């Protein structure tokens, strides 16, 4: 009677950057849906392809728990069929995404007075990300005609930037911790059931 490790994902002390988003593979457990069952109004809760009141009555093959950090103006992109720097270059959700997204304002946790430059994001990429693609490459992005060869220069920039979360910023520039729960049902034994 193992319980699905959801506390380890929501109650984590440190979250990942959006470009290197962390994923916890949860399987063969009993799902105590309660972290999402009754969520307060100050929680952004959007489910796609599945109803939350029905999750206790469904068994899935695997459930994926993706967690990372973005700013408030970018949470609208963590959704199926969305475009933008986060959706295209950091964390993309498919068009037929089956699962829920959870986001809450973490300005009291991830924002320092002198700036919290620890959280990063990808600004430049040659093409868009496929759904559930994770690109941790830090190769100098070529924006011009001459090859970079690992040289930061004109039309040759480092593809990652910092967020600089300061508490005195607006709500759209404050850090939001996002947890994306994917519910997968493939030709396999269903093991993640509810109770």
């Amino acid at each position, epitope marked *: 009677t193992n319980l699905c490790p959801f506390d380890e994902v929501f109650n984590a002390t440190r979250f990942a950057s959006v470009y290197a988003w962390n994923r916890k593979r949860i399987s063969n457990c009993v799902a105590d849906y309660s972290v999402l069952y009754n969520l307060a109004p100050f929680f952004t809760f*959007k489910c796609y392809g*599945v*109803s939350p009141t*029905k999750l206790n009555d469904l068994c899935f093959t695997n459930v994926y728990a993706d967690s990372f950090v973005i700013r408030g103006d970018e949470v609208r992109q963590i959704a*199926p*069929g969305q475009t933008g720097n986060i959706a295209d270059y950091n964390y993309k959700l498919p068009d*037929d995404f089956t699962g*829920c997204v959870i986001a809450w304002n973490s300005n009291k946790l991830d924002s320092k007075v002198s700036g919290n430059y620890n959280y990063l994001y990808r600004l430049f990429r040659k093409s868009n990300l496929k759904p559930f693609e994770r690109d941790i490459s830090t190769e100098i992005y070529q924006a011009g005609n001459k090859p970079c060869n690992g040289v930061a220069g004109f039309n040759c920039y480092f593809p990652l930037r910092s967020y600089s979360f300061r508490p005195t910023y607006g709500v759209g520039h404050q850090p939001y911790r996002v947890v994306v729960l994917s519910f997968e049902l493939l030709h396999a034994p269903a093991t993640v059931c509810g109770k």
Partner: antibody
Amino acid sequence: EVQLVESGGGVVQPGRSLRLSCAASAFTFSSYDMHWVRQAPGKGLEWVAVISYDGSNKYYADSVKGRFTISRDNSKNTLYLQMNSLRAEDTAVYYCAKDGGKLWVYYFDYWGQGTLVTVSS
Amino acid sequence: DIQMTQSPSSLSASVGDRVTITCRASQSISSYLNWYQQKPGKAPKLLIYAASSLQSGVPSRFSGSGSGTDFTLTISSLQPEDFATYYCQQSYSTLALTFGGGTKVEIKR
């Protein structure tokens, strides 16, 4: 043969409270999800809230979040909707709808006749 | 949220015609599209759920098709009790259920 009968609607001042009811008949009430959907005079339909079959789960639309409270009494086959801090924009006919239950998602297969809630000072 | 667009907002047809109502979604909503009829002063009634599945009791003249973003309700033979407004409603975002603008099927003269 499925019946849903609302009551509790009337005229209410802005910022006051109002409570609606919805008596269910001729179906296993305690095993289906229940919805509230409102419609402003002359406007379209707007989904309000949903409560699970056992009432332990409650979800609300962003326009009525933290302002309305949905509950249910499975021993009396009645669905409730406590509406606090009413604004003029809440003026609408409030229907209670039964979830179809056949799909992984929500869909309303039977509605009540509806009760009118007018908010004005 | 997801925006549902219905065209046309109103169409005139007589009894016996074949009426087709269109419904577009701003993003792909898979097959989770529903069709509702509502007479004036009455409650809405479910016609089609899951894009194409016919609800029990609804006459066989109603039918639905389409997937992704474009959807279509079709009445093979319009009957007098079919002059009403028809709303399409997406259920992909289960916590953000949104309806369309509706199409009013009026008596042509």
